[PDB]
Amino acid sequence: YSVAGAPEALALRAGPPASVRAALLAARRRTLDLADDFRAALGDAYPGIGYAPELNPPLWELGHVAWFQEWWIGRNRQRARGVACEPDHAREPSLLPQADAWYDSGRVAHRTRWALPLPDAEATRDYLERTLAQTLALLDELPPDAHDDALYFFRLVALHEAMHAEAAAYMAEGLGIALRELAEDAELELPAQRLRMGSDAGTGFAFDNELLSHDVSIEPLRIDAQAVSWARFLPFVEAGGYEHPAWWSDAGRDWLARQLLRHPAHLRWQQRWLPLDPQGAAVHLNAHEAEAWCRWAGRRLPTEAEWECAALTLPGFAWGRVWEWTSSPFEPYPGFAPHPYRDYSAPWFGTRRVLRGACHATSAALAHARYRNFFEPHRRDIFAGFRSCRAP
């Protein structure tokens, strides 16, 4: 097995306090550069955007990032216990008396986020600054041989902020907001083998959905060396794919039937409205579109096990351009237990499909071969594509 990600991903998960500190500062730099992109387009208007289930107001997102960090660091009286932390212990107050009523994604109703008396952009940035100052002061108290338990929440809040930064990028793309921030095709042989799937104990930070690590049998297959390109995808559209329900699942057909334009999201070929690059990774495809292309090509999506095995064993397996739909429903591994942020994984089993890899907007500190992403299979706003495989 190769390393699961770039140095930053390994350091945030396994490295000492100095490593988590650098990660928190990089995450905040990125949060604020994206906040400036939104500021340029919306001028700090709140809510600044119309309502959609796939959005949150930009100033709500910023406050949520600070709230989350403050909730799990400064206000957390059991930081040292890591995953043994009692999530519902009595906490110190927030810097903002109403923060818990505004920013708690577990408490605040979705449409309500457009109608809160939130602080302005300046005061929201002030809350971010003061909370980060508090977090770094507490981090600086930990010794260089600090245990995984001691670092657990520092690592969690850095990863959480990386995830909200990516969400800013895909929501920006949805809102037509501009931000400042493939090779030759090939097929790879994946031989029959046993995969030790998920995150092993004492490998540093794991998301709860990566556990338990467990051996699984991988069947021999041939897998795309990279994500499906527009060049490889569009011949399905040109061959009448979005007119031929027979290529689709029942859920796919139901979805397809309800679509005005019988072609991919952000296309007209022109994307966004610039002309389309065939060498680009097909993106803003949902699981239904990926699966239909696979039936038409006589290919299939990998399981997340097959994807993880390929990513860790095959040097020519190139990922990180688009999130990649797998055939795997988001379900607990054997021995799954929810970690202190209980609602991260457990409410979303069944209704979500696993995507693996990462996209151009994923932080280098998050992108990881063991990471399970999870969205409802109709979602196209996300930076999602896919790679295909077949039996030998």
Ligand SMILES: C[N+](C)(C)[C@@H](Cc1cnc[nH]1)C(=O)O
């Ligand atoms: C891991 N995904 C991307 C599915 C999560 C990330 C997340 C942010 N705050 C809580 N969870 C999501 O978007 O709900």
Ligand SMILES: OC[C@H]1O[C@@H](S)[C@H](O)[C@@H](O)[C@@H]1O
């Ligand atoms: O805004 C991104 C992300 O934020 C988290 S906090 C929300 O709960 C989730 O529904 C959404 O996908």
Ligand SMILES: [Fe+3]
């Ligand atoms: Fe969140």
